[PDB]
Amino acid sequence: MTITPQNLIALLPLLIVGLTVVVVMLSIAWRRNHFLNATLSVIGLNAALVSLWFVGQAGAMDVTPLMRVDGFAMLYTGLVLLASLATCTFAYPWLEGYNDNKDEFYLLVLIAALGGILLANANHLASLFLGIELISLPLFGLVGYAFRQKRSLEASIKYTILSAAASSFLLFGMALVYAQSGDLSFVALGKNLGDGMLNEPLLLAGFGLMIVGLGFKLSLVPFHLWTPDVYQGAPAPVSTFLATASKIAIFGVVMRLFLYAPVGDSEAIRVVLAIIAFASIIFGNLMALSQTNIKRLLGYSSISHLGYLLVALIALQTGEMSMEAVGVYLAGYLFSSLGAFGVVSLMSSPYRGPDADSLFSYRGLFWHRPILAAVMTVMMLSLAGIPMTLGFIGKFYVLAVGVQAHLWWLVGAVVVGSAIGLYYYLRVAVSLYLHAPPSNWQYSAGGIVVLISALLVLVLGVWPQPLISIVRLAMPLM
Amino acid sequence: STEVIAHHWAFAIFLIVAIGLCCLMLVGGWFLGGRARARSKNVPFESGIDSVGSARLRLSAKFYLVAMFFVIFDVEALYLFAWSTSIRESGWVGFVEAAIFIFVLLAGLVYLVRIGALDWTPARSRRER
Amino acid sequence: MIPLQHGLILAAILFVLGLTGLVIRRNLLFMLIGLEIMINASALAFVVAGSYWGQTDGQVMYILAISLAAAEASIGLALLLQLHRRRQNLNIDSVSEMRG
Amino acid sequence: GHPNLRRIMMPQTWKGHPLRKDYPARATEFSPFELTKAKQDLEMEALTFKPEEWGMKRGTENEDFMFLNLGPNHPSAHGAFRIVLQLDGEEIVDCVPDIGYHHRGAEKMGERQSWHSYIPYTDRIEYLGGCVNEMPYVLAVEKLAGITVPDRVNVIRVMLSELFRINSHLLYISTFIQDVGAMTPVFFAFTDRQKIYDLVEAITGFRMHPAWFRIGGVAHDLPRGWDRLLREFLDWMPKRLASYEKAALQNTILKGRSQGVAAYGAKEALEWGTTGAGLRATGIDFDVRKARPYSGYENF
Amino acid sequence: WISPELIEILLTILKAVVILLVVVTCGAFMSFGERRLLGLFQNRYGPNRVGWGGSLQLVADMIKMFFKEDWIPKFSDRVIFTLAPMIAFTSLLLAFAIVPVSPGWVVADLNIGILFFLMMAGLAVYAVLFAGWSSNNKYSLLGAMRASAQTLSYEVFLGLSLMGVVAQAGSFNMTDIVNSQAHVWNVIPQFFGFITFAIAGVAVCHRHPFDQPEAEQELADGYHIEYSGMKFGLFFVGEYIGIVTISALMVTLFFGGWQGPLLPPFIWFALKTAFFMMMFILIRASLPRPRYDQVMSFGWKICLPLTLINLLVTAAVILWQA
Amino acid sequence: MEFAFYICGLIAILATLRVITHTNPVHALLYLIISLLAISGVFFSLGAYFAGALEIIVYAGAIMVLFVFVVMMLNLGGSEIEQERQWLKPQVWIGPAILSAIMLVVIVYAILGVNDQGIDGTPISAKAVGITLFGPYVLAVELASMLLLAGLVVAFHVGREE
Ligand SMILES: CCCCCCCCCCCCCCCCCC(=O)OC[C@H](COP(=O)(O)OCCN)OC(=O)CCCCCCCCCCCCCCCCC
Ligand SMILES: CCCCCCCCCCC1=C(C)C(=O)C(OC)=C(OC)C1=O
Numbered sequence A: 001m002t003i004t005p006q007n008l009i010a011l012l013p014l015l016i017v018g019l020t021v022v023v024v025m026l027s028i029a030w031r032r033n034h035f036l037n038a039t040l041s042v043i044g045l046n047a048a049l050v051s052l053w054f055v056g057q058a059g060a061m062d063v064t065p066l067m068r069v070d071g072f073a074m075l076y077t078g079l080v081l082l083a084s085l086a087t088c089t090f091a092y093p094w095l096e097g098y099n100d101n102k103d104e105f106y107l108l109v110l111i112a113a114l115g116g117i118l119l120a121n122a123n124h125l126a127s128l129f130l131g132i133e134l135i136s137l138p139l140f141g142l143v144g145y146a147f148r149q150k151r152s153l154e155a156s157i158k159y160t161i162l163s164a165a166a167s168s169f170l171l172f173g174m175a176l177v178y179a180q181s182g183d184l185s186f187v188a189l190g191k192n193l194g195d196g197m198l199n200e201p202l203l204l205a206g207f208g209l210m211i212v213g214l215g216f217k218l219s220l221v222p223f224h225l226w227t228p229d230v231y232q233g234a235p236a237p238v239s240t241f242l243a244t245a246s247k248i249a250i251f252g253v254v255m256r257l258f259l260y261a262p263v264g265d266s267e268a269i270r271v272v273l274a275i276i277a278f279a280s281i282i283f284g285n286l287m288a289l290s291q292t293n294i295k296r297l298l299g300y301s302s303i304s305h306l307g308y309l310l311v312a313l314i315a316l317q318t319g320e321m322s323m324e325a326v327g328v329y330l331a332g333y334l335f336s337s338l339g340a341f342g343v344v345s346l347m348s349s350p351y352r353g354p355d356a357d358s359l360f361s362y363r364g365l366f367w368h369r370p371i372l373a374a375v376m377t378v379m380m381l382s383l384a385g386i387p388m389t390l391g392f393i394g395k396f397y398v399l400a401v402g403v404q405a406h407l408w409w410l411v412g413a414v415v416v417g418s419a420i421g422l423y424y425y426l427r428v429a430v431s432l433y434l435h436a437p438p439s440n441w442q443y444s445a446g447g448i449v450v451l452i453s454a455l456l457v458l459v460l461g462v463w464p465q466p467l468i469s470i471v472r473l474a475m476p477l478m
Numbered sequence B: 001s002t003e004v005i006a007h008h009w010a011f012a013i014f015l016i017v018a019i020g021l022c023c024l025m026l027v028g029g030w031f032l033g034g035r036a037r038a039r040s041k042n043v044p045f046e047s048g049i050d051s052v053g054s055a056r057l058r059l060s061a062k063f064y065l066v067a068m069f070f071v072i073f074d075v076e077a078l079y080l081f082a083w084s085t086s087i088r089e090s091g092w093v094g095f096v097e098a099a100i101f102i103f104v105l106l107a108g109l110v111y112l113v114r115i116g117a118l119d120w121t122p123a124r125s126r127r128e129r
Numbered sequence C: 001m002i003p004l005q006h007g008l009i010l011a012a013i014l015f016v017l018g019l020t021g022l023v024i025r026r027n028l029l030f031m032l033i034g035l036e037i038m039i040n041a042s043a044l045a046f047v048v049a050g051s052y053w054g055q056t057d058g059q060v061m062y063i064l065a066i067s068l069a070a071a072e073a074s075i076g077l078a079l080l081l082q083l084h085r086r087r088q089n090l091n092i093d094s095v096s097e098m099r100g
Numbered sequence D: 001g002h003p004n005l006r007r008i009m010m011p012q013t014w015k016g017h018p019l020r021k022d023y024p025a026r027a028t029e030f031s032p033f034e035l036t037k038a039k040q041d042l043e044m045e046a047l048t049f050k051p052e053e054w055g056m057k058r059g060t061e062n063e064d065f066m067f068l069n070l071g072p073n074h075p076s077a078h079g080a081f082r083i084v085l086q087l088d089g090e091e092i093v094d095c096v097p098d099i100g101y102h103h104r105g106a107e108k109m110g111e112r113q114s115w116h117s118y119i120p121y122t123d124r125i126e127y128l129g130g131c132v133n134e135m136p137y138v139l140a141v142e143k144l145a146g147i148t149v150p151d152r153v154n155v156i157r158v159m160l161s162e163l164f165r166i167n168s169h170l171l172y173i174s175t176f177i178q179d180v181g182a183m184t185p186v187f188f189a190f191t192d193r194q195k196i197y198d199l200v201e202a203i204t205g206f207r208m209h210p211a212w213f214r215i216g217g218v219a220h221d222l223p224r225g226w227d228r229l230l231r232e233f234l235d236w237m238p239k240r241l242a243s244y245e246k247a248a249l250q251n252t253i254l255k256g257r258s259q260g261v262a263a264y265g266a267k268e269a270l271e272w273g274t275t276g277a278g279l280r281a282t283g284i285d286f287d288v289r290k291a292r293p294y295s296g297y298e299n300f
Numbered sequence E: 001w002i003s004p005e006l007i008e009i010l011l012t013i014l015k016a017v018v019i020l021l022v023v024v025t026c027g028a029f030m031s032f033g034e035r036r037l038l039g040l041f042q043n044r045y046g047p048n049r050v051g052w053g054g055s056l057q058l059v060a061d062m063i064k065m066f067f068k069e070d071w072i073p074k075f076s077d078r079v080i081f082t083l084a085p086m087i088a089f090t091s092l093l094l095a096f097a098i099v100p101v102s103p104g105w106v107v108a109d110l111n112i113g114i115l116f117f118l119m120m121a122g123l124a125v126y127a128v129l130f131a132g133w134s135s136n137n138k139y140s141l142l143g144a145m146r147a148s149a150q151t152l153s154y155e156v157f158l159g160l161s162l163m164g165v166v167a168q169a170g171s172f173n174m175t176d177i178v179n180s181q182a183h184v185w186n187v188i189p190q191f192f193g194f195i196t197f198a199i200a201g202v203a204v205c206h207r208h209p210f211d212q213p214e215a216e217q218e219l220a221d222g223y224h225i226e227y228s229g230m231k232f233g234l235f236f237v238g239e240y241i242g243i244v245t246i247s248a249l250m251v252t253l254f255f256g257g258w259q260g261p262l263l264p265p266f267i268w269f270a271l272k273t274a275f276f277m278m279m280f281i282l283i284r285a286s287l288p289r290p291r292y293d294q295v296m297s298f299g300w301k302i303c304l305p306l307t308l309i310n311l312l313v314t315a316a317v318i319l320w321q322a
Numbered sequence F: 001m002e003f004a005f006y007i008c009g010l011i012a013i014l015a016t017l018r019v020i021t022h023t024n025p026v027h028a029l030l031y032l033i034i035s036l037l038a039i040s041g042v043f044f045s046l047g048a049y050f051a052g053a054l055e056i057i058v059y060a061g062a063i064m065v066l067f068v069f070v071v072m073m074l075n076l077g078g079s080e081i082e083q084e085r086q087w088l089k090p091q092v093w094i095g096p097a098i099l100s101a102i103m104l105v106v107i108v109y110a111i112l113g114v115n116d117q118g119i120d121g122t123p124i125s126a127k128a129v130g131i132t133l134f135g136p137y138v139l140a141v142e143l144a145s146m147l148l149l150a151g152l153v154v155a156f157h158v159g160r161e162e
């Protein structure tokens, strides 16, 4: 099978993102202009987002031995492109706080966006590997973008060493899986077995090593300890991108890998994934109890929400409802993290020196900056799965999927973790309103983005039918 | 076949006699000729006068960025090594893809040249004035 | 006449050796050699896996693996440069400011 | 108010001041040179560069500077010159040029030798100058005595000075070309130096240290046939010079190694006492052969 | 041991040993020939007194180098110090071990070929690096750093300069390369590849003008100044077999190797290799040494894009005529 | 060829073990080059000639710049060696040694349970790898070039002096 102009049309966001990455690189080489480079990044990402329409008009196609494009890939492409656009929008005033060069940030942002597209359209072990590292490497760049800062350099070193080790683990597991199977496509990972002989120690150990690597990428326990350190160390737009786009992209490729492979029917993988989900939910919700820092609290929040997502993913083989639940909760998670980390980005922007403290001091935010406090408190209302918000719709979908396949331990863990999350989220929300002891249109653009996220959360919590409809329209190959 | 085994044996004997000749040459150099007994024999040569410190100090270098770019460009080079041996069977589609590859390489190199990378010369001379 | 199991065992041995050299060494450089050892062991396992089935896919995965190894070595070397310039010491146990 | 008042000719372990009248001049008056282990160690430690005495600031908070002794005995060091140079990587931070490894005490010899016997010592002051080194000494002595030399003496001394100037400039060009990296034209340049040496052997009787100029004239008269050798040299030179130019001095590699390297303006050439080629290259047209013409240089 | 297969294996082994002895003896004879040819280029004779024409000067130099005191410094790492001449002597010899000198006269008919040459160059850099670091000298340290920078400069584009010839032959085998030039020699279609490979191959052996590590004028002989005895002679012989290897490699990938119209094939190979050896002596004598920062700038900004453009043009020409 | 594979595996194991437990960085790099040459011998034994060729071509370039950083940073005489010696203590390495041992035991047990037919040692030329690399695996090449571009940009940004 070769490449056709129809396949060229179906690859439009990847082509647009790569071409505009080359464009912004050549613009950096031509002249160090910040506004023009960030602007070209914005039209590049928006051009990919509107070429999604032409991809949808094209149709689902198996474009490569590697790539398969359908509604699943289109939806996750749209989510990661929205996250990249928001990351640029919040990164702009923080970069006018930056004394050093500010142009490589957006270049790394759309290279990581290209990696997200590659993971979204991934239907191959090679493409999955390349997407993981094409997401990871610009995050190594962006976490240590402010290398003069202590915490940014420390988090960059930690994330680089840990993600290279996890890439080594995932590569070795992929090599063992390929040694057993002899083909690297997702659909052929366990096709030679039959009559109940789907379990074999080499394939199981290979998939366990990929489970280790991917659970590092989704902060699953016990590969979760990097998350608060990296989230606090990295800049606030970098924290936004790592919380949104990376988590959506690797969880989408994990959903793809566990749906199109025949290894999902194996009970041992399901049991160990249930154990990982239980541990992730309980540990992530418990560790954010006495946290006085917003970034580490949101890191443990990311751990707990990826545990909920894994709980939804476990019941994929029995029920035909788990995939749309995963999509709905991923959309709600994207909007929630975008709003929350956007408030962190606006209250962190501009970059007021590396040696000066970057403490948040969220207490009493309403009395001087009321709109950002309103967005932050509705964001914590959304993160706890409280009604009139999209997080409740995601939690309801996860609970219904768990009830459908009779996974009661996960349901109890969800309830307990939701109670602890209620405690610390609403403690933050009330502390927003207590008694504590700009002037540019890009800061206004970031305020518009967080206000749009808050209004979307409220509207889709009150009326969740359009989101469910557009998620069910993303109907991939059964 | 017979010729493959003959060439493998010839290559093995080539390596064996090469290392044997080198080791015998070193042994003959080491064992023939008298030694020396001098006060300042075991001093590193710094043009007749003693050193200020040692030769094992922390030497700076300006070649770090060029070293990393060398490794990256050698990996792109190995990709082109894989391409070049099968150009005829790849067809024109492979030519277009390798043209995109080399265009990304050229854009990266122009980016390196223009931003001040690959330019580590001291600001005093720089072959100016 | 070479079993695949012996090659996979060899790759696993070098993999755990690189992991041990990563964990027991607090020098950032020796961690970078450790990482290169694990990456090359995984690539070696891919090469044996491709050689067993007579496919070029293992060698393609090897090429991707060494591309990742080179890029990660360059980035880790730059981070090591920054750490040694801004702290004058290459101990990774001193990188512990963020906790709790 | 002087910043670093330290010895520059004599070593730091030296007692007495050599140019004072009570200090003896000859080494046979003093004890002979016995090199023992203790004296060798003391003089080797005295010659050791101590960076705190010049305020060198050895090392930095991040990475250490490394000190290099280029001379003495370096292929690029043209003589007994030692420079102590501080490097960060390849870049030079500061330089401490140490001289005194070539001191002969020629002024004390001027207080030791007679007027006539001091001419070989003046000749060896610059060993590529010869008669050019002889000329100011004998002219100053003729000023002291009240001697006006005839025209033929002036022409002979001008001719010998220009011959040795061509020899010195040939050696300088060959050493510059070799120091850039081209090792070929130095052999041909020394062949033209051999032609000049044949002419100078014919006239003065010696190759490189002629010791030929005298008070009020020269030692001998010109031998029968010097014009033939001068004609041969004047035919031999310009084609060889054009060959050297087209082979090395128009090379773009030599231009890259040479143009823009160690450039200074007229204020640096004036405040530092720079004369000769550097002063004329800075636009200051102060030549002694034109501004204050000596030895009948107005006739050329 | 009476079998046609075993006598064929023995004949191949004998041919490989003969090739090795001849190239080592030719490297030493061409050290002597460098002395004589530098004399010829610089309007003199050089050593012409030890025997007829100075032919026994090499034997006298060998006697002196064997009976010179082989000195290992106390401040040096002894194993690395002894190991560096071994690498310098052997890496370029194994690089030569793939060069086909005649039809039916080759040591190893590898399927990699010029890949093996790139491997041996990448292994040959460690001889200079280990000689610079091990000897524990500041001049040797600066020479090793300069050698590393020069190696960056040339090895960024050496293989890409060879990829034009690789693409034209369509294979990595040496005999396929020398058989693809049966009509036209590869210097005419690959000319930019030819000049870039000339620059990179002079930089392989660190010969002039790329003698940044062992610069006589700049660092006072550079990295091997603590090196003495037969180890320094091993450095010399290793660089001279390096020159022979690069010359024979240009003969094979740009001048048809052994292919010639009238003379026997080994005679044509010998004449072209000797012409390139003469060109090495001429390139030492003729033009001066540039600054290594400008050397690396020239190797990065000029040579590498030129090799990439030449590879693209060669691929387009090859696919046009298919 | 079987003996070559086994002896290269043994040399790689011993050299890696000497790498991970050495105090001299340059000696550790030398043992690393020995280990990578042994890995290349393993690659050349199995018929993957291109894999061993690139293992010696571009990894020797990679260990080269590691050597440049080692001489630029670490070498201070014995001061690096004693500082590394005080760091390594018996309990410190017997901590994770049992973890690596049990991990190796589990992985080996999982490996031994697979069906095998023996690697026939059929050589794979670089032409087939070129066909597959620029055929079915095109976007792997293109987005890997983008990956190398990203790594180059990050190396520029973080590695700068000022
Ligand atoms: C078997 C293998 C060997 C076979 C023997 C025959 C071939 C021998 C090949 C020898 C190659 C030598 C290459 C030397 C390259 C030197 C490059 C260099 O450093 O150039 C720098 C120099 C100054 O650069 P600049 O821009 O002024 O400085 C920037 C500072 N701000 O830049 C300049 O001065 C500008 C001019 C640069 C010229 C670069 C080299 C041109 C090509 C090589 C020379 C010709 C060789 C023979 C060609 C065929 C002749 C028939
Ligand atoms: C290369 C063989 C000799 C060629 C002819 C002489 C080359 C120029 C030598 C210049 C020089 C002089 C005069 C010189 O006096 C000197 O100091 C002792 C040097 O350093 C060793 C020199 O290099």
Ligand SMILES: CCCCCCCCCCCCCCCCCCCC
Pocket: E018, E019, E020, E022, E023, E026, E101, E102, E105, E264, E265, E266, E267, E269, E270, E271, E273, E274
């Ligand atoms: C100056 C020539 C340098 C050559 C270096 C390589 C020589 C290797 C040894 C070759 C020996 C065999 C020569 C060919 C024999 C068969 C043909 C004979 C008639 C010409």
Ligand SMILES: CCCCCCCCCCCCCCCCCCCC
Pocket: C093, F095, F096, F098, F099
């Ligand atoms: C100052 C900080 C130092 C941190 C050193 C960390 C060393 C960790 C060593 C872990 C060893 C584990 C051995 C196996 C334990 C049992 C199996 C896992 C738990 C069930």
